[PDB]
Amino acid sequence: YSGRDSLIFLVDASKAMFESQSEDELTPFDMSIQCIQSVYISKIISSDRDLLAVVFYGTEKDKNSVNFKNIYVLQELDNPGAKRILELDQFKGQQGQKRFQDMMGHGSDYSLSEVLWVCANLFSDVQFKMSHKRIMLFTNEDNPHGNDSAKASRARTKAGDLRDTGIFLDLMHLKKPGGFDISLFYRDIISIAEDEDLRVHFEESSKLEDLLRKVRAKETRKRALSRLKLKLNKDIVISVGIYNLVQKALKPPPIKLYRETNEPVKTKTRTFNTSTGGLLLPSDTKRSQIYGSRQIILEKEETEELKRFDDPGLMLMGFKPLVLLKKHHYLRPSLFVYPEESLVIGSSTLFSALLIKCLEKEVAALCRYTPRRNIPPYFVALVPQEEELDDQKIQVTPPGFQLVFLPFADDKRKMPFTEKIMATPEQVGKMKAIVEKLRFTYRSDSFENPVLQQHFRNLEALALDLMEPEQAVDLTLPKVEAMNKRLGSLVDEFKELVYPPDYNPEG
Amino acid sequence: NKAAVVLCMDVGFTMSNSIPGIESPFEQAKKVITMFVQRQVFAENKDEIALVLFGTDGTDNPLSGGDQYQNITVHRHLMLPDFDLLEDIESKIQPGSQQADFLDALIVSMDVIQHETIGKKFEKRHIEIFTDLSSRFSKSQLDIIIHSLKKCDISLQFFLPFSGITEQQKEGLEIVKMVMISLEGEDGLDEIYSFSESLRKLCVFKKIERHSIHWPCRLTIGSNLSIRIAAYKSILQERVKKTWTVVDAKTLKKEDIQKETVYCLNDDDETEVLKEDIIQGFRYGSDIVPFSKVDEEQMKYKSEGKCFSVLGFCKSSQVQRRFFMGNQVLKVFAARDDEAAAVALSSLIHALDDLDMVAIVRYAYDKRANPQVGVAFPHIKHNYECLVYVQLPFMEDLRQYMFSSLKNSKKYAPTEAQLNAVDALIDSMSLAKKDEKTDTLEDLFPTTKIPNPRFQRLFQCLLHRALHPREPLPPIQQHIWNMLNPPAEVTTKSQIPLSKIKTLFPLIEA
Amino acid sequence: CPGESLINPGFKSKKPAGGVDFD
Amino acid sequence: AGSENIRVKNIILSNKHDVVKPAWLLECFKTKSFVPWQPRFMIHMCPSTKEHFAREYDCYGDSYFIDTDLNQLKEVFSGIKNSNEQTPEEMASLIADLEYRYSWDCSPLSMFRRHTVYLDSYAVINDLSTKNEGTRLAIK
DNA sequence: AAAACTATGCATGCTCTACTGCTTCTGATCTAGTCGACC
DNA sequence: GACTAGATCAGAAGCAGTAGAGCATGCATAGTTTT
């Protein structure tokens, strides 16, 4: 998967889209605009290099390259930004609806062939490489051309051509007074007609709920940290790729702005001798260290040469039972090792054999790891990792090796000696009851970073000029009230059974 | 912490000669002392070393009297080690033609310790005797020596050229054993080392050692239960405590160097902008939104500090090792001198161990530290029991990559012969031995007992530069490579399997 | 294909964070 | 800043500057003069500007040293929030005191205030259960 | 002689600035083909 | 002849990730002064 995702938002501007069936409900136009804004914000946070565009059809004005009638291209394909969201924000209500009607117009005829032609033309203009091409059609008219059969055939031909070119078409049908029947016309236009998506729908599509679900986490495409050589011997070498399935998420780095016009300023660091005042190149300086009441001077090149031990790669050392590995010897986040046939042919077979036999024999491959040049070696254990899939056949545990860093003698620390006081069985049983009361199922994706979420909320509020920032719910905070309710009198009994009457833990 | 070591050596002619096929004992003693002094210099423990020699024509002792306490020189009094001492041992220490009794050497060493010890808080005192025991022993004051040593709480160690000796050497060994038995008894027999054994141990620089700060808090389950706990850091990636200082290539001083930062605009004129007019900002898609630091602090996420709370309890199977994050592992004990807290924590640990469960908890070092979600699991040993805490990932830190399956890949399906070759390789390169008598696994290559080679290299280079100012840096020592490589048996056994694997697996570089 | 993201193609729709849900 | 967005609130949360309603620029441009600030325009003051205003201005927009006009009094009467800490009797006594002191009794209304009036709207005197509603006496 | 206040060293976290490796965009070059018009 | 279009290689810029240095917080410990 290489390229950028391109998305075009087609929104109908017919009269039927501007009527509210119930007093307390959203018109189709308002729902469409809300969805567009939500997708824009999600894209800004997640993938900022993707291309989005917004088009309207059924209007009185026209703005397009082909000079077609009744098609207004509001925003051509470009990366998302705050200005575009603000531009869309002036159609978000009833006054916004009046503003939209005044600016463009509504209630005019149209041809779907021309609309799809304009969308394809927009796709053609893009000069980058697009991995996906998608159009979403927001409408509530199941039979756009019931009077004219020729227009329907033209639309079918254009949809077929677009599908051939590699453009996905999706229908996001909104609520209709009489109900939406995809069976009438939109079966041929739609890219994929699901078996369940054939009955008449009396409510908006289930895709709107997913669109309105804001995603506020960066999505990074697959990428290999390094391509290394695993050396079983001086002659047997295979090529492997190293990946990181867990990486800490950090706030985007701040940029320095000039206050009077908000234009970026570039910074530069230079070193100049106190006496002469002139600049000193890096070649006109040395390095020093004090030890034993003396000064030891070394050049920079030697300072870097001190770190050179062996060439980049993994060197096999032997095989170790998995029992000898320890869970409390964690040192650094683990990595993933997978085969790579691009550099050496036949690596996949040997890697598969090693994985299978390591799983059968319950062993881990001990190795010496040197990621880059001028990096002292570390010791790693490659633990086999079988393939595990969930119910829906979506792979959840990939096959390969897990690279775990092992500590050196210097990385451990000495603990103060503490006398052991064991607990009588009754205390252990009471605490077992307490533990059992508060049992729950844990998943790796059950928590969110409060700091990053608040940062993104604040940034969005500042950018879009909202009244107040949205406040994120912190799921890491304990639920004290629920725990107190569940435990009941267990806490009091345990405290009576384990703490003297006059202890005062707080003091 | 502090420790004063009085190294008492000899320069008698009896060591000036030895069998040509082995190094002379005097050279062995010199090498041992050099290695010890190097370790002390590059391990800043504030210990002190004094050097005394007996068997030299010179006579310089605090106590002279008559013929007794003669032919002994206190070469170096008690001060912190420095390169000047290494230079002194390099050249100043010279052999001699006279003899002397090591008993008098012990007397003078004890006298020096007693005289110079006052005024400093040296809690330990060790005296090391390097003698070949060739000279006769004037055993006439043993009782007073033992009484003084026991009164002053001073430890004594011996270093000999042997672990085929003359009767005089046997008598010396006997008297030394008697003295050690009197001082300590049976265990003393392990305090007499040989030169080869000492050279074995003193070939590695002292490991970087730091002291963990005790972090107190209260482990909470709900709003009414709290256990006073202290946490320490058990495993972390060690770094050099000293960093390089940039100096000017001519005057060799850091005072003639300093850095400056210059800000300029995005214009041809290259306008200069001061630090008092630079605001902070971020990029929101295709634009830049100002966000000052003051407003960032106002709108920041604020949390109550020093939290160790129990979100819940989950089966150990649901927490997997591959998801551990962070850069540290914490060990949580009950608060010092608190029996009630000890009982509470023991109850929790035993309950979790019995039920096969771990505690998902929230951790915050202080007010300025970001909150964390981690796992605390029990650790029970035969002497101590505690909790071990390791951080766990957030939603944003997980990466969902898809990889093809190798089990069902027709292209890369191994054959039976290939699998047999790999099995033979795995069995030949085993790094653990299964003793059947105890049915126990022994680790042939323990990685956790290997000092970091980086610090060995750094200290070797620094020492070589200090003692040889104008000379290129040396290569990596052989023993470092030996201790980073597996035992020779594993390599020897694995050649035939490796040849078979090379034969069966076609690998073509592209 | 099933359970794919309608915003970022090629990625699976992550389930919303649920925190602690006691049994 | 004419809109109370997040940036205005942030500037408020720091007492290091002051905010002005956009009408100040309109007044300055129309008159082409540097008309000073007045409480009507400002939406927040620094401590120092607060001290400056407190000398020539009360806690409410009404000033000390300059007469007032109907529009200004309307702004003042739109400034504070509310006051409902009295009771009918207390309010009536206050009103009577004000009228007596400042001689406003000649006004067409409020001239029955000093008088309490009873009516024979009940079949029996001092009987609330015999209301005689449905007569000209009610409208009287 | 005992207790309270202060100095200095060291651990700890977070933030910011260089260096290496992977991916994508642009420029430059070569090779193959098309078109105008003549004969 | 003239010109255009498709494919390919090389270099460079952008981005991600690790390492190293610097800055602020607090306390351990000891020393010094006061009563």
PDB file of N, CA and C in Angstrom, chain A residues 370-439:
ATOM      1  N   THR A 370      23.401  -5.444  16.841  1.00  0.00           N
ATOM      2  CA  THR A 370      24.012  -4.140  16.588  1.00  0.00           C
ATOM      3  C   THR A 370      23.187  -3.441  15.515  1.00  0.00           C
ATOM      4  N   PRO A 371      22.265  -2.555  15.893  1.00  0.00           N
ATOM      5  CA  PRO A 371      21.340  -1.995  14.900  1.00  0.00           C
ATOM      6  C   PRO A 371      22.020  -1.169  13.823  1.00  0.00           C
ATOM      7  N   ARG A 372      22.770  -0.157  14.235  1.00  0.00           N
ATOM      8  CA  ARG A 372      23.447   0.763  13.333  1.00  0.00           C
ATOM      9  C   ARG A 372      24.948   0.686  13.572  1.00  0.00           C
ATOM     10  N   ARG A 373      25.696   1.422  12.759  1.00  0.00           N
ATOM     11  CA  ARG A 373      27.131   1.524  12.956  1.00  0.00           C
ATOM     12  C   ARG A 373      27.429   2.359  14.194  1.00  0.00           C
ATOM     13  N   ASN A 374      28.576   2.089  14.813  1.00  0.00           N
ATOM     14  CA  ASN A 374      29.016   2.834  15.991  1.00  0.00           C
ATOM     15  C   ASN A 374      27.985   2.756  17.115  1.00  0.00           C
ATOM     16  N   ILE A 375      27.545   1.535  17.419  1.00  0.00           N
ATOM     17  CA  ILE A 375      26.635   1.276  18.523  1.00  0.00           C
ATOM     18  C   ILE A 375      27.133   0.022  19.231  1.00  0.00           C
ATOM     19  N   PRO A 376      27.419   0.069  20.530  1.00  0.00           N
ATOM     20  CA  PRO A 376      27.913  -1.127  21.199  1.00  0.00           C
ATOM     21  C   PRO A 376      26.879  -2.228  21.158  1.00  0.00           C
ATOM     22  N   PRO A 377      27.308  -3.484  21.183  1.00  0.00           N
ATOM     23  CA  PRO A 377      26.362  -4.584  21.017  1.00  0.00           C
ATOM     24  C   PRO A 377      25.461  -4.740  22.227  1.00  0.00           C
ATOM     25  N   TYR A 378      24.277  -5.286  21.982  1.00  0.00           N
ATOM     26  CA  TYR A 378      23.392  -5.733  23.044  1.00  0.00           C
ATOM     27  C   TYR A 378      23.083  -7.204  22.841  1.00  0.00           C
ATOM     28  N   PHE A 379      22.528  -7.825  23.869  1.00  0.00           N
ATOM     29  CA  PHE A 379      22.127  -9.218  23.804  1.00  0.00           C
ATOM     30  C   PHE A 379      20.613  -9.281  23.699  1.00  0.00           C
ATOM     31  N   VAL A 380      20.128 -10.056  22.738  1.00  0.00           N
ATOM     32  CA  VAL A 380      18.705 -10.169  22.476  1.00  0.00           C
ATOM     33  C   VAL A 380      18.336 -11.639  22.435  1.00  0.00           C
ATOM     34  N   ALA A 381      17.083 -11.920  22.759  1.00  0.00           N
ATOM     35  CA  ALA A 381      16.507 -13.244  22.611  1.00  0.00           C
ATOM     36  C   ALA A 381      15.347 -13.145  21.637  1.00  0.00           C
ATOM     37  N   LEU A 382      15.378 -13.981  20.607  1.00  0.00           N
ATOM     38  CA  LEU A 382      14.286 -14.095  19.655  1.00  0.00           C
ATOM     39  C   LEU A 382      13.391 -15.232  20.123  1.00  0.00           C
ATOM     40  N   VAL A 383      12.198 -14.887  20.579  1.00  0.00           N
ATOM     41  CA  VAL A 383      11.215 -15.853  21.063  1.00  0.00           C
ATOM     42  C   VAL A 383      10.226 -16.121  19.935  1.00  0.00           C
ATOM     43  N   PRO A 384       9.952 -17.378  19.591  1.00  0.00           N
ATOM     44  CA  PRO A 384       9.022 -17.640  18.490  1.00  0.00           C
ATOM     45  C   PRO A 384       7.641 -17.080  18.782  1.00  0.00           C
ATOM     46  N   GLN A 385       6.945 -16.679  17.720  1.00  0.00           N
ATOM     47  CA  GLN A 385       5.609 -16.106  17.833  1.00  0.00           C
ATOM     48  C   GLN A 385       4.744 -16.726  16.746  1.00  0.00           C
ATOM     49  N   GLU A 386       3.816 -17.588  17.156  1.00  0.00           N
ATOM     50  CA  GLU A 386       2.907 -18.246  16.236  1.00  0.00           C
ATOM     51  C   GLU A 386       1.831 -17.274  15.758  1.00  0.00           C
ATOM     52  N   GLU A 387       1.113 -17.688  14.720  1.00  0.00           N
ATOM     53  CA  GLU A 387       0.035 -16.891  14.153  1.00  0.00           C
ATOM     54  C   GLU A 387      -1.262 -17.208  14.884  1.00  0.00           C
ATOM     55  N   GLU A 388      -1.910 -16.177  15.424  1.00  0.00           N
ATOM     56  CA  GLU A 388      -3.186 -16.337  16.109  1.00  0.00           C
ATOM     57  C   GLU A 388      -4.206 -15.401  15.486  1.00  0.00           C
ATOM     58  N   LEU A 389      -5.367 -15.949  15.134  1.00  0.00           N
ATOM     59  CA  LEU A 389      -6.440 -15.210  14.487  1.00  0.00           C
ATOM     60  C   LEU A 389      -7.686 -15.235  15.361  1.00  0.00           C
ATOM     61  N   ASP A 390      -8.461 -14.156  15.296  1.00  0.00           N
ATOM     62  CA  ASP A 390      -9.684 -14.044  16.076  1.00  0.00           C
ATOM     63  C   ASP A 390     -10.820 -14.765  15.351  1.00  0.00           C
ATOM     64  N   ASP A 391     -12.049 -14.582  15.837  1.00  0.00           N
ATOM     65  CA  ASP A 391     -13.185 -15.300  15.267  1.00  0.00           C
ATOM     66  C   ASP A 391     -13.409 -14.921  13.810  1.00  0.00           C
ATOM     67  N   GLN A 392     -13.315 -13.635  13.490  1.00  0.00           N
ATOM     68  CA  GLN A 392     -13.588 -13.151  12.142  1.00  0.00           C
ATOM     69  C   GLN A 392     -12.429 -13.379  11.182  1.00  0.00           C
ATOM     70  N   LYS A 393     -11.459 -14.213  11.548  1.00  0.00           N
ATOM     71  CA  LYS A 393     -10.295 -14.529  10.727  1.00  0.00           C
ATOM     72  C   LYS A 393      -9.393 -13.325  10.500  1.00  0.00           C
ATOM     73  N   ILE A 394      -9.570 -12.257  11.269  1.00  0.00           N
ATOM     74  CA  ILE A 394      -8.645 -11.131  11.245  1.00  0.00           C
ATOM     75  C   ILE A 394      -7.450 -11.486  12.120  1.00  0.00           C
ATOM     76  N   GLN A 395      -6.260 -11.479  11.528  1.00  0.00           N
ATOM     77  CA  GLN A 395      -5.056 -11.851  12.255  1.00  0.00           C
ATOM     78  C   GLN A 395      -4.796 -10.869  13.389  1.00  0.00           C
ATOM     79  N   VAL A 396      -4.572 -11.404  14.590  1.00  0.00           N
ATOM     80  CA  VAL A 396      -4.290 -10.584  15.755  1.00  0.00           C
ATOM     81  C   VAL A 396      -2.864 -10.766  16.268  1.00  0.00           C
ATOM     82  N   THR A 397      -2.254 -11.928  16.066  1.00  0.00           N
ATOM     83  CA  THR A 397      -0.858 -12.159  16.439  1.00  0.00           C
ATOM     84  C   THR A 397      -0.106 -12.641  15.206  1.00  0.00           C
ATOM     85  N   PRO A 398       0.799 -11.843  14.643  1.00  0.00           N
ATOM     86  CA  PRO A 398       1.478 -12.243  13.408  1.00  0.00           C
ATOM     87  C   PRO A 398       2.533 -13.302  13.669  1.00  0.00           C
ATOM     88  N   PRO A 399       2.977 -14.010  12.630  1.00  0.00           N
ATOM     89  CA  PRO A 399       4.031 -15.012  12.802  1.00  0.00           C
ATOM     90  C   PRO A 399       5.417 -14.417  12.634  1.00  0.00           C
ATOM     91  N   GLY A 400       6.338 -14.855  13.477  1.00  0.00           N
ATOM     92  CA  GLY A 400       7.692 -14.333  13.369  1.00  0.00           C
ATOM     93  C   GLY A 400       8.451 -14.535  14.666  1.00  0.00           C
ATOM     94  N   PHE A 401       9.365 -13.607  14.941  1.00  0.00           N
ATOM     95  CA  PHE A 401      10.149 -13.662  16.165  1.00  0.00           C
ATOM     96  C   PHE A 401       9.988 -12.370  16.949  1.00  0.00           C
ATOM     97  N   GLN A 402       9.919 -12.496  18.269  1.00  0.00           N
ATOM     98  CA  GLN A 402       9.856 -11.357  19.171  1.00  0.00           C
ATOM     99  C   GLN A 402      11.246 -11.129  19.744  1.00  0.00           C
ATOM    100  N   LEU A 403      11.794  -9.945  19.498  1.00  0.00           N
ATOM    101  CA  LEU A 403      13.141  -9.587  19.921  1.00  0.00           C
ATOM    102  C   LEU A 403      13.045  -8.896  21.275  1.00  0.00           C
ATOM    103  N   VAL A 404      13.576  -9.546  22.312  1.00  0.00           N
ATOM    104  CA  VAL A 404      13.538  -9.039  23.678  1.00  0.00           C
ATOM    105  C   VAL A 404      14.965  -8.740  24.113  1.00  0.00           C
ATOM    106  N   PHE A 405      15.175  -7.553  24.672  1.00  0.00           N
ATOM    107  CA  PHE A 405      16.504  -7.132  25.089  1.00  0.00           C
ATOM    108  C   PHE A 405      16.815  -7.679  26.474  1.00  0.00           C
ATOM    109  N   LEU A 406      18.008  -8.250  26.635  1.00  0.00           N
ATOM    110  CA  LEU A 406      18.392  -8.792  27.927  1.00  0.00           C
ATOM    111  C   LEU A 406      19.350  -7.845  28.633  1.00  0.00           C
ATOM    112  N   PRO A 407      19.256  -7.703  29.952  1.00  0.00           N
ATOM    113  CA  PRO A 407      20.099  -6.731  30.648  1.00  0.00           C
ATOM    114  C   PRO A 407      21.515  -7.231  30.871  1.00  0.00           C
ATOM    115  N   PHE A 408      22.429  -6.277  30.995  1.00  0.00           N
ATOM    116  CA  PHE A 408      23.778  -6.553  31.454  1.00  0.00           C
ATOM    117  C   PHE A 408      23.836  -6.434  32.972  1.00  0.00           C
ATOM    118  N   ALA A 409      24.995  -6.774  33.534  1.00  0.00           N
ATOM    119  CA  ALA A 409      25.138  -6.738  34.984  1.00  0.00           C
ATOM    120  C   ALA A 409      24.975  -5.328  35.523  1.00  0.00           C
ATOM    121  N   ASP A 410      25.321  -4.320  34.725  1.00  0.00           N
ATOM    122  CA  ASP A 410      25.250  -2.940  35.184  1.00  0.00           C
ATOM    123  C   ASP A 410      23.824  -2.412  35.213  1.00  0.00           C
ATOM    124  N   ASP A 411      22.900  -3.061  34.506  1.00  0.00           N
ATOM    125  CA  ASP A 411      21.540  -2.555  34.385  1.00  0.00           C
ATOM    126  C   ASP A 411      20.653  -2.916  35.569  1.00  0.00           C
ATOM    127  N   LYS A 412      21.066  -3.851  36.417  1.00  0.00           N
ATOM    128  CA  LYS A 412      20.306  -4.184  37.610  1.00  0.00           C
ATOM    129  C   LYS A 412      20.771  -3.335  38.789  1.00  0.00           C
ATOM    130  N   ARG A 413      19.985  -3.366  39.862  1.00  0.00           N
ATOM    131  CA  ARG A 413      20.269  -2.576  41.049  1.00  0.00           C
ATOM    132  C   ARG A 413      20.031  -3.425  42.288  1.00  0.00           C
ATOM    133  N   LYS A 414      20.677  -3.029  43.379  1.00  0.00           N
ATOM    134  CA  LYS A 414      20.602  -3.751  44.640  1.00  0.00           C
ATOM    135  C   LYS A 414      19.487  -3.168  45.495  1.00  0.00           C
ATOM    136  N   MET A 415      18.675  -4.043  46.063  1.00  0.00           N
ATOM    137  CA  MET A 415      17.501  -3.708  46.849  1.00  0.00           C
ATOM    138  C   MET A 415      17.843  -3.720  48.336  1.00  0.00           C
ATOM    139  N   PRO A 416      17.322  -2.786  49.131  1.00  0.00           N
ATOM    140  CA  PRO A 416      17.513  -2.892  50.581  1.00  0.00           C
ATOM    141  C   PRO A 416      16.926  -4.191  51.109  1.00  0.00           C
ATOM    142  N   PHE A 417      17.634  -4.805  52.053  1.00  0.00           N
ATOM    143  CA  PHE A 417      17.170  -6.057  52.631  1.00  0.00           C
ATOM    144  C   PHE A 417      15.960  -5.799  53.516  1.00  0.00           C
ATOM    145  N   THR A 418      14.916  -6.605  53.338  1.00  0.00           N
ATOM    146  CA  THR A 418      13.680  -6.455  54.091  1.00  0.00           C
ATOM    147  C   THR A 418      13.271  -7.805  54.657  1.00  0.00           C
ATOM    148  N   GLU A 419      12.997  -7.838  55.958  1.00  0.00           N
ATOM    149  CA  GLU A 419      12.507  -9.055  56.585  1.00  0.00           C
ATOM    150  C   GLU A 419      11.114  -9.387  56.064  1.00  0.00           C
ATOM    151  N   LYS A 420      10.851 -10.680  55.905  1.00  0.00           N
ATOM    152  CA  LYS A 420       9.588 -11.160  55.361  1.00  0.00           C
ATOM    153  C   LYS A 420       8.627 -11.474  56.498  1.00  0.00           C
ATOM    154  N   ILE A 421       7.402 -10.973  56.385  1.00  0.00           N
ATOM    155  CA  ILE A 421       6.310 -11.325  57.283  1.00  0.00           C
ATOM    156  C   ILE A 421       5.198 -11.919  56.432  1.00  0.00           C
ATOM    157  N   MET A 422       4.927 -13.204  56.623  1.00  0.00           N
ATOM    158  CA  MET A 422       3.913 -13.893  55.841  1.00  0.00           C
ATOM    159  C   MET A 422       2.539 -13.686  56.459  1.00  0.00           C
ATOM    160  N   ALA A 423       1.509 -13.915  55.653  1.00  0.00           N
ATOM    161  CA  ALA A 423       0.133 -13.710  56.077  1.00  0.00           C
ATOM    162  C   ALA A 423      -0.538 -15.040  56.388  1.00  0.00           C
ATOM    163  N   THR A 424      -1.352 -15.045  57.440  1.00  0.00           N
ATOM    164  CA  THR A 424      -2.119 -16.223  57.800  1.00  0.00           C
ATOM    165  C   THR A 424      -3.211 -16.473  56.759  1.00  0.00           C
ATOM    166  N   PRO A 425      -3.685 -17.716  56.639  1.00  0.00           N
ATOM    167  CA  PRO A 425      -4.635 -18.027  55.556  1.00  0.00           C
ATOM    168  C   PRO A 425      -5.890 -17.171  55.547  1.00  0.00           C
ATOM    169  N   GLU A 426      -6.382 -16.731  56.706  1.00  0.00           N
ATOM    170  CA  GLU A 426      -7.629 -15.970  56.724  1.00  0.00           C
ATOM    171  C   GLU A 426      -7.478 -14.639  55.999  1.00  0.00           C
ATOM    172  N   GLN A 427      -6.364 -13.941  56.222  1.00  0.00           N
ATOM    173  CA  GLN A 427      -6.141 -12.678  55.528  1.00  0.00           C
ATOM    174  C   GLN A 427      -6.055 -12.898  54.024  1.00  0.00           C
ATOM    175  N   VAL A 428      -5.366 -13.960  53.608  1.00  0.00           N
ATOM    176  CA  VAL A 428      -5.247 -14.259  52.187  1.00  0.00           C
ATOM    177  C   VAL A 428      -6.616 -14.557  51.590  1.00  0.00           C
ATOM    178  N   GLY A 429      -7.470 -15.267  52.328  1.00  0.00           N
ATOM    179  CA  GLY A 429      -8.802 -15.557  51.818  1.00  0.00           C
ATOM    180  C   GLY A 429      -9.664 -14.315  51.682  1.00  0.00           C
ATOM    181  N   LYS A 430      -9.617 -13.433  52.679  1.00  0.00           N
ATOM    182  CA  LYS A 430     -10.372 -12.188  52.585  1.00  0.00           C
ATOM    183  C   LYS A 430      -9.893 -11.351  51.403  1.00  0.00           C
ATOM    184  N   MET A 431      -8.575 -11.266  51.210  1.00  0.00           N
ATOM    185  CA  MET A 431      -8.064 -10.510  50.074  1.00  0.00           C
ATOM    186  C   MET A 431      -8.374 -11.206  48.755  1.00  0.00           C
ATOM    187  N   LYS A 432      -8.473 -12.536  48.758  1.00  0.00           N
ATOM    188  CA  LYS A 432      -8.925 -13.249  47.568  1.00  0.00           C
ATOM    189  C   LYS A 432     -10.345 -12.854  47.212  1.00  0.00           C
ATOM    190  N   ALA A 433     -11.214 -12.748  48.217  1.00  0.00           N
ATOM    191  CA  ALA A 433     -12.572 -12.283  47.961  1.00  0.00           C
ATOM    192  C   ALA A 433     -12.563 -10.877  47.378  1.00  0.00           C
ATOM    193  N   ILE A 434     -11.751  -9.990  47.956  1.00  0.00           N
ATOM    194  CA  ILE A 434     -11.679  -8.621  47.446  1.00  0.00           C
ATOM    195  C   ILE A 434     -11.209  -8.615  45.996  1.00  0.00           C
ATOM    196  N   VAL A 435     -10.195  -9.420  45.680  1.00  0.00           N
ATOM    197  CA  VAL A 435      -9.691  -9.488  44.311  1.00  0.00           C
ATOM    198  C   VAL A 435     -10.772  -9.997  43.372  1.00  0.00           C
ATOM    199  N   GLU A 436     -11.476 -11.057  43.775  1.00  0.00           N
ATOM    200  CA  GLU A 436     -12.493 -11.640  42.911  1.00  0.00           C
ATOM    201  C   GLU A 436     -13.627 -10.664  42.645  1.00  0.00           C
ATOM    202  N   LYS A 437     -13.951  -9.807  43.614  1.00  0.00           N
ATOM    203  CA  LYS A 437     -15.030  -8.852  43.393  1.00  0.00           C
ATOM    204  C   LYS A 437     -14.693  -7.881  42.266  1.00  0.00           C
ATOM    205  N   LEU A 438     -13.435  -7.448  42.178  1.00  0.00           N
ATOM    206  CA  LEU A 438     -13.017  -6.425  41.228  1.00  0.00           C
ATOM    207  C   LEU A 438     -12.373  -7.009  39.974  1.00  0.00           C
ATOM    208  N   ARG A 439     -12.764  -8.215  39.573  1.00  0.00           N
ATOM    209  CA  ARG A 439     -12.222  -8.810  38.360  1.00  0.00           C
ATOM    210  C   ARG A 439     -12.792  -8.123  37.126  1.00  0.00           C
TER     211      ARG A 439
END
